Design a protein around this ligand. Structure first.
Ligand code: B46
Ligand code: B46
Lengths: 203, 203
């Protein structure tokens, strides 16, 4: 399970000491947002490096589905955050539909994050869910009204896991983000660094 | 296990009826070859569409390691062909080293292949291994001498699994291959179609 991930992180996210794994945490989440872009629902992805060296990834896609599978009793949100290798494609009712997994899965990003905050806007509502080291602190909650749809996630990588290189390199993130923007022509991808105020916009 | 894959293929490889999954079989193997390119050992990858609508992917990298883990007793070759989600990075002695999984894993390509033939050239030897529906027909065998190093694999997708679209589209494969070649500047990527003789060379 995720216990196996926390125990041998380099085997799932990549090297936890030279910065490879650390930056892969970002791309793993960005890959998911691109799926929404490819489905033609996401027009913009914004990646922000925060001063405390957490990273947020947000998109204006449909929002990860939050309602439980009417048979299995678990939402797509819960599944992809807490089940190793969970990925692929779901529908609005959290039924799993055909689609390949790709990457390692964001449940790994969650497991190796000291804190991960998930905020999902859909069906008129803001939904919130805090995880710590991959453990949900409460069930996913409705906390307000909204007209927007999309997903926002911020994660703080665990300093129990990542060593030596514990801070994100702008150039590395800007490298991957500039590539993806050229492959998906319609999708705007912004990169913001809140430490010094540098912005990039790949469209 | 791979039994779960054969049972619900669309959940692992993607849609098995509209051709998405079928072409993903190729890219899943090509992604692995690129890892060798990135490590600076592979200078060329060649993808061939065969007349019977099997596809081969070959590279001139180091060759997948074939010797058993001195503790676990299994080679990298065996692991990545027969273990779901097996991927990442190994060393020459089949120890697993830090590295992220990415994609779904080629053991899925194997599971959904009526036949897969693996030929590995390294340490002076040609090594061969036939799989059928993911089952090894014999242990990996040494069948001759060679000075070359590299990996060759040909797979015949299972017509028990893939329906309707059972033949590969050149343009789709050429799409992905042309992209990857531009991202990895030093690596030549060829595409050959043996049905009509069309060739492409992305460098
Ligand atoms: C860290 C972390 C987690 O945050 C994220 O994974 N954020 C990236 C993301 C994922 C999605 C959506 S919206 C959606 C959907 C499907 C059907 C109907 N409506 C919405 N599905 C997804 N994903 C499902 C899992 C595989 C990637 C795509 N939007 N933004
Ligand atoms: C279908 C199918 C299977 O065929 C393939 O996966 N073919 C692609 C491939 C993979 C490799 C090698 S060589 C090597 C290596 C490592 C250390 C020392 N020497 C060689 N490692 C790999 N892979 C290990 C698994 C993840 C992708 C890279 N060469 N060509």
């Amino acid at each position: 399970g995720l216990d196996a991930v926390r125990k041998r992180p380099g085997m799932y996210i990549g090297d936890t000491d030279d910065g490879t794994g650390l930056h892969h945490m970002v791309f793993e989440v960005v890959d998911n947002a691109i799926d929404e872009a490819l489905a033609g629902h996401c027009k913009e992805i914004i990646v922000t490096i925060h001063a405390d060296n957490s990273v947020s990834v947000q998109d204006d896609g449909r929002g990860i589905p939050t309602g439980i599978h009417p048979e299995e009793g678990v939402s797509a949100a819960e599944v992809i955050m807490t089940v190793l290798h969970a990925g692929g494609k779901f529908d609005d009712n959290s039924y799993k539909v055909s689609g390949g997994l790709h990457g390692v899965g964001v449940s790994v990003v969650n497991a190796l994050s000291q804190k991960l905050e998930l905020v999902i806007q859909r069906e008129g509502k803001i939904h919130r869910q805090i995880y710590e080291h991959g453990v949900p602190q409460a069930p996913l909650a409705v906390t307000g009204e909204t007209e927007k749809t999309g997903t926002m996630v911020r994660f703080w990588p665990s300093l129990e896991t990542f060593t030596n290189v514990t801070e994100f390199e702008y150039e590395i993130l800007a490298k991957r983000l500039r590539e993806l923007s050229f492959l998906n022509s319609g999708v705007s991808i912004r990169l913001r660094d809140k430490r010094d105020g540098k912005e990039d916009h790949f469209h």
